[PDB]
């Protein structure tokens with residue numbers, strides 16, 4: 001009767017685990033082997049995936065034909081009548097038409113994530129689910145959603161390779177009728193201030209606040225060429241106070257520590273300094289140099305690791 | 321080999337009978353601890369305990385203990401719940417994952433809502449991590465429900481192992497999810513939560529798996545804009561440049577051929593960070609497979625020709641050094657970087673370009689015809705078919721794909737007067753192949769407004785009419 | 801052919817061990833002068849010292865002395881800076897240039913800003 005090849009098509013094109021498990025059990029209780037589920041990224045196929053796709057659907061005669069010609073997944077999506085007839089030894093047009101039916105079934109169930117920029121396969125699928133075979137043919141010509149209104153019928157015939165004129169008319173009709181300086185600077189300590197600074201940057205960029213990070217990237221000998229351009233452009237300032245944050249800022253009477261440079265630059269600018277305390281006691285005013293003693297008079301915010309959302313909202317209520 | 325199996329089967333029989341028989345409050349957790357300790361003893365055997373641990377997981381599955389663990393995950397007590405979760409974490413093999421996809425989905429998903437204790441979350445993150453590796457249907461059922469939100473909330477923690485489990489969970493979900501799964505991750509900003517996971521200087525594996533997840537999300541062309549707006553691609557290349565693959569190859573015992581096929585389209589997706597991640601991982605795992613004797617897997621899958629394309633078309637020193645080290649640790653030679661001045665090529669550079677990309681059969685064909693770089697840029701269908709003995713159109717089409725890749729990365733300084741290649745590149749980066757075809761006709765920026773379609777077809781040799789229409793439209797609307 | 805290699809390897813081993821061990825203000829520059837004088841003796845051999853100088857640059861690279869020179873280029877003293885620069889000038893072979901492109905970019909670029917003394921600039 002021929003239910004075995006239909007079960008092989010169920011296994012090789014499965015989007016459900018139950019029918020695939022039942023088809024694998026049905027092919028296991030019979031006398032033949034079970035096939036494998038194919039990799040959907042067909043433009044990412046090498047030669048072995050093409051050979052496996054040949055072995056699973058019933059083209060075992062033409063396995064040596066594609067291997068000598070070195071046909072990968074990029075050449076399988078772009079194969080025509082003449083290359084099947086002359087170069088591949090597939091002289092019969094009925095065998096070629098069965099191969100194009102299997103190619104239609106393959107190019108329906110395919111992942112085009114490596115080349116589709118504007119999600120053209122879902123545009124083709126919203127009209128008719130058999131239109132998704134020309135996704136590679138329209139993407140490989142350089143098209144997207146913003147360029148289909150200037151495409152003609154000859155460009156779909158010759159370049160995109162759409163042989164049916166009804167599909168060309170429907171694609172043209174549907175293409176014509178419905179288509180047409182950071183703000184928050186964060187200084188942190190190298191030892192235990194990286195994760196809290198990155199977490200503050202993520203929770204501020206969830207609300208659209210542009211945040212500059214990587215002070216340590218500018219610690220490669222660049223003295224003041226980019227720190228001034230970062231802080232002068234920064235609308236606000238966040239001082240991550242790790243446990244032991246201002247230890248290296250004590251007795252630094254030569255302006256060598258980078259966190260001390262950030263504090264002196266922020267006090268020279270006069271920006272809104274918002275300290276973030278993560279288990280850190282307030283240091284003495286007299287042990288710090290006189291160019292940074294004003295940081296102890298700003299309204300700091302204590303950090304809670306299990307109640308972070310209200311703390312981030314309190315930070316957002318204390319910014320511009 | 322089979323002695324550890326005969327030592328470990330009846331002990332787990334007695335332990336699973338004790339778990340099935342006793343239903344107390346503290347002896348059940350003690351039995352779970354005994355089974356989990358025997359699992360720890362099973363996985364820690366050098367080159368023995370892999371098949372032993374797979375057989376013991378098969379013995380747990382065939383006894384019915386997986387349904388017992390699914391019952392104990394719904395227990396109201398916390399201690400037996402965390403021991404049942406930590407026992408279920410270490411037994412998720414490819415035969416158990418089918419059973420968990422059949423029944424166990426929805427029970428672990430119920431534990432994904434309880435997020436406050438750390439001892440649940442450290443194991444449930446690993447359970448979801450290994451359950452993202454099953455299929456695309458399980459990825460859709462976890463992302464559409466509250467399975468992705470649990471990982472994206474647990475990325476806020478400071479646990480140096482739970483963040484590893486979350487990084488591997490997002491990486492496996494990006495590898496095995498699909499189009500709609502990547503859309504529901506990135507539209508819910510899953511790439512932004514990897515930023516503390518890509519920067520944390522406490523662990524080195526954690527940043528690597530975070531940048532792996534970032535690169536696999538960045539291999540999708542409909543996604544790359546929000547990933548560049550996330551800012552996590554800037555931390556990939558200094559991380560790969562600052563580390564050495566030999567130490568991370570000695571630290572890790574490799575991955576199978578199914579997972580090796582996931583690292584290959586990282587190199588052919590024309591993004592710098594994804595190519596660096598793929599070259600680093602294939603170099604480390606090529607060192608692993610060169611310690612063993614199974615280096616024929618890369619020739620069966622085909623990553624060697626992609627590494628040769630990385631070396632022969634390198635614009636970065638780090639990915640080129642990693643690809644040269646990966647090809648050196650294998651059994652073949654490394655290629656040389658080509659000279660970009662293709663109109664300045666003589667015959668020997670053309671022969672070298674043939675030898676580096678896989679046209680060793682046609683090396684004697686171009687030498688007798690005296691094809692230099694000027695004739696290589698101006699080669700067509702008929703000269704390949706008749707004069708060069710390349711009768712097959714599929715071989716000609718592979719040669720034109722390699723010619724497209726060559727004429728994309730080419731120096732035209734000897735003939736381009738008005739910088740036409742940057743004019744072609746500003747529209748579409750695949751338009752730079754016709755730079756020689758438009759310059760060789762005598763054109764520049766001040767003459768494209770009087771060019772017709774027939775002049776682009778016959779003289780410039782543009783075979784695609786869509787590209788002809790776009791070039792004519794851009795020549796008419798913005799030049800003059 | 802290989803006699804100059806066997807004469808020049810343990811002397812550079814002792815000299816790079818003296819550069820790695822001593823961290824003074826004037827003996828380090830004397831060790832840099834000894835290494836640079838042996839480099840001058842290495843490049844001035846008729847049709848012999850090419851592969852010999854390449855092997856000695858490989859021996860300097862595999863010992864870790866290139867990172868030592870990159871550390872001494874960030875020294876606050878001027879004399880050890882100019883001897884480290886003049887030593888780094890004569891050892892830039894195609895295998896060393898990969899290491900300098902990996903790490904050494906940005907340290908030499910920092911010396912590109914200091915332009916007034918001639919003894920730095922002639923070597924940089």
Ligand SMILES: NC(=O)c1ccc[n+]([C@@H]2O[C@H](COP(=O)([O-])OP(=O)(O)OC[C@H]3O[C@@H](n4cnc5c(N)ncnc54)[C@H](O)[C@@H]3O)[C@@H](O)[C@H]2O)c1
Nearest residue numbers: 363408409410411412413414450453573574575576577579
């Ligand atoms: N030390 C540990 O605690 C430990 C170690 C490993 C696994 N586990 C547990 O095991 C479960 C996951 O294991 P898995 O089996 O599903 O892994 P997996 O299938 O997801 O990863 C592939 C593994 O299979 C191996 N492999 C498969 N085919 C191979 C081949 N042809 N040649 C060489 N190697 C091949 C690879 O080496 C690789 O380790 C999890 O529960 C995990 O916690 C624990």
Ligand SMILES: NC(=O)c1ccc[n+]([C@@H]2O[C@H](COP(=O)([O-])OP(=O)(O)OC[C@H]3O[C@@H](n4cnc5c(N)ncnc54)[C@H](O)[C@@H]3O)[C@@H](O)[C@H]2O)c1
Nearest residue numbers: 839840843844850853854888889890891892893894895897
């Ligand atoms: N007298 C000196 O002080 C002296 C002389 C030479 C080099 N150096 C130093 O060496 C470094 C640069 O040397 P380099 O090796 O990088 O030079 P290079 O590679 O930039 O220049 C090419 C050199 O390699 C030789 N060469 C390479 N392949 C050859 C081949 N197949 N056949 C014949 N000759 C071949 C050439 O003769 C030529 O001298 C610098 O630091 C420079 O100061 C110093």
